[PDB]
Structure formats: structure tokens, C-alpha cells
Amino acid sequence: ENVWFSHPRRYGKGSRQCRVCSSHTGLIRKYGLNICRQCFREKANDIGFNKFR
């Protein structure tokens, strides 16, 4: 009863979102974080990412 309400999302910006805030922009999909670069900065420490050099 609902077919026209959908369009393909197999790739690109709309195929993914931040796992914290669903921000389509600024994502870090490196290493499978799937966190945007801005939520990652607040939460880099508890994951295990630390600044040394």
C-alpha cells in the first residue's frame, strides 16, 4: 500500500548517517566508526582515540 514513498539509498550521502546524531555531513566512516567528525571529537576519548603528537 506504499511503494511511491521510497527512492534508492544504496550509496552516497543519503545511504548513511551519523550513529549519534544522523548528520549526513562530516561523517568518519574510516575504520567503521560511522560517527560524524564533530560528535567524534567529543567522544574520541572514551572510544580509545587519544592525542599524542
Binding site: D46, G48, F49
Partner: protein
């Protein structure tokens, strides 16, 4: 499950980060000072440190099994 160690440790950190923000959103009154994860074989134990144990353990075994089932239901854990 044959997942690379770099991606697995990253997912372990995201797992810890998920537990960290989850616990402080409900156990805010308990004086949530953090949490620890110990992955023993077939039994990963979540060591919740809270300054008010009388309510995180709840009464008669409540308020902790619900959180125990919530983490099980999300993370697809037996």
C-alpha cells in the same frame, strides 16, 4: 566472527561509548562515575560504578535486569 582486529577494537570502543552515554541518561541520580567492560570468555561483564547502589540494584532484583535486558536486546546478545 572473523572481523579484523582494528575494526573490532574500534567497535569495542563504540560499544563502551554507547554504554557510557546510555547509563548516564538514566543512572544520572546514581552518581554514575563511569563503567568498565571485562570480556571474559562467553561472559562479558559490565561493571557499573555508581555512588548510590541502593537504586541501581533496585529492589528485589529490579531496575538492573531491565538494563541487563536492554543492552542484550540492542546488541543482539544471547
Amino acid at each position: 566472527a572473523l572481523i579484523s582486529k582494528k575494526r573490532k577494537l574500534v567497535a569495542d570502543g563504540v560499544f563502551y561509548a554507547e554504554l557510557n552515554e546510555f547509563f548516564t541518561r538514566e543512572l544520572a541520580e546514581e552518581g554514575y562515575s563511569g563503567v568498565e567492560v571485562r570480556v571474559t570468555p562467553t561472559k562479558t561483564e559490565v561493571i557499573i560504578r555508581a555512588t548510590r547502589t541502593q537504586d541501581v540494584l533496585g529492589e528485589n532484583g529490579r531496575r538492573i535486569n531491565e538494563l541487563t535486558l536492554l543492552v542484550q536486546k540492542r546488541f543482539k546478545y544471547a
